[PDB]
């Protein structure tokens, strides 16, 4: 679920999902066009594609369980949708962590009109 993804993001990065990643660039929280602005935005692009791989799942509301094995996120077994949603979220959270070094506050609240063109997943 979105709240769980948010908790995962905070655990990984120390930033609150809202507002640090809810309106970032072209793809983080609400976005489907444009060239991703940087590596963090590409995390969201891929995450959006990942959710797109699950048309019959409900990633925003369906809850999954996960644990930590010495820092590492381990998605626990739920329904097939839950497992796949968790893997998408885990990847994005790790990606945000991997790219914290280039995160730029100038991409927060990024205006929609600066996001043009469809990029295939």
């Amino acid at each position: 679920s979105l709240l769980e993804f948010g908790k995962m993001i905070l655990e990984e990065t120390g930033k609150l999902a809202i507002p640090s990643y809810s309106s970032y660039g072209c793809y983080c929280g609400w976005g489907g066009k444009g060239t991703p602005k940087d590596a963090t935005d590409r995390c969201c692009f891929v995450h959006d594609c990942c959710y797109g791989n699950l048309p019959d799942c409900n990633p925003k509301s369906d809850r999954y369980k996960y644990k930590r094995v010495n820092g590492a996120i381990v998605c626990e077994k739920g329904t097939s949708c839950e497992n796949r949603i968790c893997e998408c979220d885990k990847a994005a959270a790790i990606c945000f962590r991997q790219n914290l070094n280039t995160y730029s506050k100038k991409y927060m609240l990024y205006p929609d009109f600066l996001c043009k063109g469809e990029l295939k997943c």
């Binding site: 979105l2 809810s22 983080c28 929280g29 609400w30």
Partner: peptide
Amino acid sequence: IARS
């Protein structure tokens, strides 16, 4: 909830 905001999308993704």
